[PDB]
Design an enzyme around this catalytic site. Structure first.
Site, PDB file in Angstrom:
ATOM      1  N   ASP A   6       1.018  -1.096  -0.019  1.00 30.07           N
ATOM      2  CA  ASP A   6       0.066  -0.185  -0.005  1.00 30.07           C
ATOM      3  C   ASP A   6       1.081   1.134  -0.048  1.00 30.07           C
ATOM      4  O   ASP A   6       2.254   1.344   0.446  1.00 30.07           O
ATOM      5  CB  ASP A   6      -1.007  -0.023   1.184  1.00 30.07           C
ATOM      6  N   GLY A   7       0.342   2.242  -0.418  1.00 32.43           N
ATOM      7  CA  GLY A   7       1.169   3.938  -0.708  1.00 32.43           C
ATOM      8  C   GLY A   7      -0.124   4.614  -0.513  1.00 32.43           C
ATOM      9  O   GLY A   7      -1.361   4.478  -0.498  1.00 32.43           O
TER      10      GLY A   7
ATOM     11  N   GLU B 184       2.579   3.641  -4.355  1.00 33.70           N
ATOM     12  CA  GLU B 184       2.022   2.568  -4.575  1.00 33.70           C
ATOM     13  C   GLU B 184       2.875   1.489  -5.291  1.00 33.70           C
ATOM     14  O   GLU B 184       3.156   0.210  -5.045  1.00 33.70           O
ATOM     15  CB  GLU B 184       0.664   2.521  -5.207  1.00 33.70           C
TER      16      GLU B 184
ATOM     17  N   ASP C 253      -4.640  -3.172  -3.267  1.00 31.25           N
ATOM     18  CA  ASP C 253      -5.831  -2.683  -3.742  1.00 31.25           C
ATOM     19  C   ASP C 253      -5.525  -1.537  -4.747  1.00 31.25           C
ATOM     20  O   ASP C 253      -6.605  -0.876  -4.803  1.00 31.25           O
ATOM     21  CB  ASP C 253      -6.742  -2.212  -2.449  1.00 31.25           C
TER      22      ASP C 253
ATOM     23  N   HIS D  41     -11.837  -2.095   0.887  1.00 25.50           N
ATOM     24  CA  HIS D  41     -12.581  -2.409   1.839  1.00 25.50           C
ATOM     25  C   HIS D  41     -12.678  -3.911   2.367  1.00 25.50           C
ATOM     26  O   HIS D  41     -13.682  -4.110   3.308  1.00 25.50           O
ATOM     27  CB  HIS D  41     -14.259  -1.945   1.744  1.00 25.50           C
TER      28      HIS D  41
ATOM     29  N   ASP E  31      -1.616  -0.168   4.765  1.00 20.16           N
ATOM     30  CA  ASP E  31      -2.246   1.288   4.955  1.00 20.16           C
ATOM     31  C   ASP E  31      -1.886   2.038   6.142  1.00 20.16           C
ATOM     32  O   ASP E  31      -1.373   2.991   5.870  1.00 20.16           O
ATOM     33  CB  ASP E  31      -3.986   0.888   4.926  1.00 20.16           C
TER      34      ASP E  31
END
Length: 155
Positions: free
Chosen positions: A10-11, A48, A70, A124, A134
């Site tokens: 994640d970024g 990301e 994601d 989500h 995250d």
């Protein structure tokens, strides 16, 4: 001991450009390695891609990888852009270097050393590792210590 390398990424970024960071979890050999760093001036997209880069570059032999993220940008690059950019010599239709060419080229080199399975998660509905990514990504952005050298308002 898992038989497949597992990577989660994640970024995050506070502006465009602004302070940003990444979080990556890697399950390699019998360990869980966690990477995270903040950059003073960068973009969400670059962070990301950085997540994925640093986790793959940690691998020292040819592995069977499952990468879960994601990230929509990584997703579009991998499924609609990359193949085509390699054919055009990494240029846009107006003949300029693609955006973040530095990172896509870097990602691309890491990719070709391994057998990769991509798992596109929904923001989500990720696993607990994606949530941790995250949280790390966010914290890193709040306390940046590195320079994102390849960034351009430009090209």
């Amino acid at each position: 001991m898992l038989k497949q390398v597992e990577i989660f990424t994640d970024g995050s970024c506070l502006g465009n450009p602004g302070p940003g960071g990444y979080g990556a979890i890697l399950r390699y050999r019998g360990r869980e390695k966690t990477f995270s760093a903040g950059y003073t001036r960068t973009t969400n997209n670059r962070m990301e891609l950085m997540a994925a880069i640093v986790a793959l570059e940690a691998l020292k032999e040819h592995c069977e990888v499952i990468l879960s993220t994601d990230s929509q940008y990584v997703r579009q690059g991998i499924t609609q852009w990359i193949h085509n950019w390699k054919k055009r010599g990494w240029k846009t239709a107006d003949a300029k270097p693609v955006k973040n060419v530095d990172l896509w080229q870097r990602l691309d080199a890491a990719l070709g050393q391994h057998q990769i399975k991509w798992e596109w998660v929904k923001g989500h509905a990720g696993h607990p590792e994606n949530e941790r990514c995250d949280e790390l990504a966010r914290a890193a952005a709040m306390n940046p210590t590195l320079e994102d050298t390849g960034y351009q308002v430009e090209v």
